[PDB]
Design a protein around this ligand. Structure first.
Ligand code: POV
Ligand code: POV
Ligand code: POV
Ligand code: POV
Ligand code: POV
Ligand code: POV
Ligand code: POV
Ligand code: POV
Ligand code: A1EBL
Lengths: 601, 114, 63, 114
């Protein structure tokens, strides 16, 4: 049995032509496979394509058809817990061998063979290789145009077939793309070729097991170039005009009237492309993808028609609430009850509005606490502080003043969330939120370590005063020493000597060492860190501000009720000529630079 | 010196104004909180509290923003721990955050301006 | 962009120092067993590695 | 020559020797990397650790990690048979022991302070 395996491993043709003369004489069912994993000698010959590969598989199939078994084990199953679904055709297509694949197809193989396996369905990208688990999608994934033409030009090729994940061919082509264009992308052109060669609309309407079309899948995974191609797919042929999303109504030199399609792009359906591409910041590629034309003009016109007067209305309401919260405490007795009840009503309203938001969010957006999740926490804390302070006010308690003071001190510092309206201040606010969590926190931790280490040393260096009045030592406890060290860290004073310390020279030496470590080292390298951070941030924070404004627009869109959502897009095309089910958008875009370059040559 | 003067006129209107607006927001928010935290002095001579009004608290916060002093504790405040916590938070937000990112902004501006 | 090299090298030196700290009996955490592919006393002591190169594969298959 | 190339600082020669694959049966013995199976982008490389693992005397890993003075010991340390060796060494041990050392020193320091 192992002799045939050794023959096919290194392409020993003479060994196999001797074996096919010796074996069948003893034969006059044949377990030619490995009998433990299902690896038949066809695959074992085809993982390693030796120079003599044609004749060996030809005589092997001739021996198979001589025993009336060629139609039985040609679709051999690699039955192992990792693969569980391989066939000879799958390996033949993968190994860049088209002839052998053509011969196997002509001999008769399983054209639609699902290669369902754990290794073939990896949990992450680096765990394994995902290719759609079909020979057709494998041929399309590994840049094999001739083989995919041969596979598609066949009778029983189930093109509209979905694997265990439910992915179609186009889902598989989307999942094997790249976030950034490598300038030699073949997945986009193979998507184009497959779309035009077969399938009208049900091939792209098939949904993943997650419930996504290839358009939504390309938006969610992060494939910017595929999303750009699909959202701006123009076909000028009348036969394939229905497979288009952009139509040029008229072209006049540099100006153009593109009629973009918003069938699944506008956020009027469930899990729209705009909502998907605006709520998945964790892949970080959601501004070069958000800058595409059908999304950029959608967000801009959404911001013009609404979500801007409402943003200013929200800022005005919060400003009035904050100023009437301030004037209640400042003008408090050591007639105007309308303000004293407006604070309660608005605090309760914003408390429940932030409570439903704090309960409806996912743990994914809490990463790095940057994706519009910190401000919800601070707004909820301020709201709960106001109502709780009111509760202790009615109960004739004493701690209401502390909670209300913290409430209004937090409220005036929470107005920085409303500065997204302006671009210039939006850059400043996103820089605030970035550097406090990136550079300030590390410096604070290091300085706190250097504070409580020197704090207890100086506190333990000095004993109690001889008069026991706690005035001649100035460091009588750990908290006192911590405060007195921080005061000279700011640069206020109290660094003088002779503080009743038994070792004045050592106390002075420790004070000088702490001064060096804080003022010369930590306070200076903090300058170093942001100084290096901003040179990379000043061109990147524009993406974050634009994405934050887009998320604000989508949030305000979701806030509107059903009856007020009559601000939809342009009406029907009437150009489909089949029930006119399309809902498009009129766009008049100008490209002066592109026109100048095109007309120059 | 013409380079220095045009840099003066550029940075005062580009970076200093934004920092001034943010710091003014952080000043009048903490200014009224500390002013409302402390009641009047028992002797009513306006010396044991050091924060008897909003303007007084604004001036005393700006003085320690420069780094002159008057940040000591026990200012007749009913909540000394909260008053200290608010003072430390204001010190962090001004000296560590705003005064440092202002350095960041012109630092990035001048490399394009020079 | 250079301190990453120093931190990685410091961590690697820490790993080697902790490896040298372990006694002889606790050093039973060796690598994968013999090959059996040398076919001459199988004296080799190899390591199994399953590495992925998606970018290299994409570039190779593109042409 | 392997240890000499690691000690002197020759990164490209060390990379070539540590990943020297020969597909000829006559010269298969003069190899250190064997591809068990290749499947598209994934690959199963069977790297050789005859003198690479720090179980012998003056191993290549110890040599390439203890000679920082030539400064070329990270582009040389990032090679696959060394990088995966250090990573898996850090996963199996030398990480629980690092945290144990930190915990012991933290307890010692806090009980010295108290
Ligand atoms: C006693 C208590 C009884 C129970 C109370 C419960 C619940 C009572 C009702 C609670 C909701 C209050 C109104 C909606 C709302 O939240 O408005 C918000 C803004 O939004 C607006 O200004 C738009 C309001 C809706 C559209 C109105 C027509 C606008 C058309 C325009 C055409 C051009 C303001 O409230 P907020 O959201 O708290 O704002 C701060 C928070 N935020 C900044 C994070 C957003
Ligand atoms: C105290 C400190 C607290 C806070 C300081 C920060 C203040 C934030 C104020 C936000 C206001 C806002 O976004 O409005 C916008 C318009 O808004 C209007 O035109 C509103 C029209 C009135 C609507 C009234 C209800 C109907 C202003 O936006 P803009 O800058 O005019 O245009 C944006 C685009 N640009 C930035 C690229 C130019
Ligand atoms: C209550 C607050 C505690 C909050 C702890 C979690 C903080 C998460 C954010 C953060 O700063 O993490 C950072 C680590 O930062 C640290 O190591 C922080 C040090 C401890 C907290 C410092 C304040 C309290 C000091 C004691 C009292 C992570 O860094 P990054 O910037 O998220 O990305 C890292 C990669 N990069 C540096 C190469 C870019
Ligand atoms: C620039 C770089 C920024 C670095 C920032 C970090 C630096 C920090 C140094 C802080 C110096 C003061 C701390 C010791 C004094 C103190 O308040 O002690 C109190 C503890 O108080 C607490 O436990 C809370 C103190 C504030 C917590 C940190 C603020 C937020 C930092 C984010 C208790 O003692 P007391 O109140 O002094 O008097 C005792 C008697 N009494 C309690 C009955 C009144
Ligand atoms: C040696 C390790 C440190 C020993 C510290 C104690 C030795 C000593 O005399 O300390 C001195 C400084 O000592 C320093 O300045 C020590 C710190 C610097 C060490 C060199 C760096 C303290 O000198 P002093 O305060 O003049 O000592 C009073 C002498 N009496 C207590 C006996 C009356
Ligand atoms: C009396 C004076 C008020 C004067 C108001 C108009 C100022 C115009 C100039 C200015 O700074 O505008 C800037 C915004 O700047 C702001 O948003 C300023 C914040 C309010 C004024 C701050 C001082 C008063 C603070 C409260 C008391 C515009 O930025 P820019 O630099 O002109 O260009 C923006 C684009 N870029 C940032 C990407 C380059
Ligand atoms: C570094 C970062 C820079 C940040 C810069 C911004 C920071 C600013 C903080 C300013 C601190 C002082 C303000 C409160 C004190 C004050 O003068 O109050 C006075 C108000 O005075 C005014 O209304 C004008 C005060 C100056 C306006 C701003 C200056 C230009 C800023 C561009 C009134 O009170 P008084 O005079 O104290 O005493 C009352 C009794 N009397 C009126 C009868 C006398
Ligand atoms: C919870 C929300 C804040 C509650 C504030 C009041 C609670 C409290 O005791 O505050 C404390 C600090 O309190 C802080 O330091 C609060 C700010 C830090 C919150 C955590 C971050 C104030 O503590 P205190 O000044 O020692 O209080 C005196 C007690 N007496 C008034 C009953 C005599
Ligand atoms: C901007 C949000 C801040 C920095 O956490 C404000 C904190 C202010 C307090 C706790 C009084």
């Amino acid at each position: 049995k192992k002799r045939i395996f050794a023959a096919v491993s290194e392409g020993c043709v003479e060994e196999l032509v001797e074996l096919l003369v010796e074996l069948q004489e003893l034969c006059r069912m044949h377990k030619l496979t490995a009998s433990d994993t299902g690896k038949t000698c066809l695959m074992k010959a085809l993982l390693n394509i030796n120079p003599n590969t044609k004749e060996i598989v030809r005589i092997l199939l001739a021996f198979a058809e001589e025993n009336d078994i060629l139609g039985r084990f040609i679709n051999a199953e690699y039955t192992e817990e990792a693969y569980e679904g391989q066939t000879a055709l799958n390996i033949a297509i993968e190994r860049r061998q088209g002839d052998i694949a053509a011969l196997l197809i002509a001999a008769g193989a399983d054209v639609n063979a699902h290669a369902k396996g754990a290794f073939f369905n990896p949990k992450y990208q680096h765990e394994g290789f995902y290719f759609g688990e079909t020979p057709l999608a494998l041929a399309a994934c590994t840049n094999q145009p001739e083989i995919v033409q041969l596979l598609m030009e066949h009778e029983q090729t189930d093109i509209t077939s979905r694997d265990s994940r439910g992915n179609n061919i186009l889902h598989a082509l989307v999942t094997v793309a790249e976030d950034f264009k490598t300038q030699n992308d073949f997945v986009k052109r193979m998507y184009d070729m497959i779309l035009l060669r077969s399938g009208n609309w049900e091939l792209e309407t098939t949904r993943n097991n997650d419930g996504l079309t290839p358009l939504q899948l390309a938006a969610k995974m992060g494939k910017a170039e595929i999303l750009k191609y699909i959202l701006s797919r123009e076909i000028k042929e009348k036969r394939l005009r229905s497979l288009s999303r952009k139509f040029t109504d008229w072209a006049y030199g540099p100006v153009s009237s593109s009629l973009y399609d918003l069938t699944n792009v506008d956020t009027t359906t469930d899990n729209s492309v705009l909502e998907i591409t605006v709520y998945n910041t964790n892949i970080d590629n959601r501004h070069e993808m958000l800058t595409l034309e059908p999304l950029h003009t959608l967000l801009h016109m959404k911001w013009k028609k609404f979500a801007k007067h409402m943003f200013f209305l929200s800022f005005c309401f919060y400003f009035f609430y904050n100023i009437t919260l301030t004037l209640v405490s400042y003008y408090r007795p050591r007639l105007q009850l309308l303000g004293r009840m407006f604070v309660l009503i608005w605090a309760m309203c914003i408390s429940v509005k932030e409570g439903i938001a704090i309960f409806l969010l996912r743990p994914s957006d809490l990463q790095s606490i940057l994706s519009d999740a910190w401000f919800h926490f601070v707004f909820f804390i301020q709201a709960v502080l106001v109502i709780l302070s009111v509760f202790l006010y009615l109960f004739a308690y004493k701690e209401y003043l502390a909670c209300l003071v913290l409430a209004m001190a937090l409220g005036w510092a929470n107005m920085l969330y409303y500065t997204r309206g302006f671009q210039s201040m939006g850059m400043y606010s996103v820089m605030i939120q970035k550097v406090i969590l990136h550079d300030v926190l590390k410096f604070l931790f290091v300085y706190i370590v250097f504070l409580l280490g020197f704090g207890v040393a100086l506190a333990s260096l000095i004993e109690k005063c001889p008069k026991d009045n706690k005035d001649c030592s100035s460091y009588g406890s750990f908290s006192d020493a911590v405060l007195e060290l921080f005061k000279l860290t700011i640069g206020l004073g109290d660094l003088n000597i002779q503080q009743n310390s038994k070792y004045p020279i050592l106390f002075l030496f420790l004070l000088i060492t702490y001064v060096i470590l804080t003022f010369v080292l930590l306070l200076n390298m903090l300058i170093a860190l942001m100084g290096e951070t901003v040179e990379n941030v000043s061109k990147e924070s524009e993406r974050i501000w634009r994405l934050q404004r887009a998320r604000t627009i989508l949030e305000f869109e979701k806030m509107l009720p059903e009856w007020l959502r009559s601000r939809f897009r342009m009406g029907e095309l009437c150009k489909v000529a089949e029930d006119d089910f399309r809902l498009c958008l009129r766009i008049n875009e100008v490209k002066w630079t592109e026109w100048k370059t095109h007309v120059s040559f």
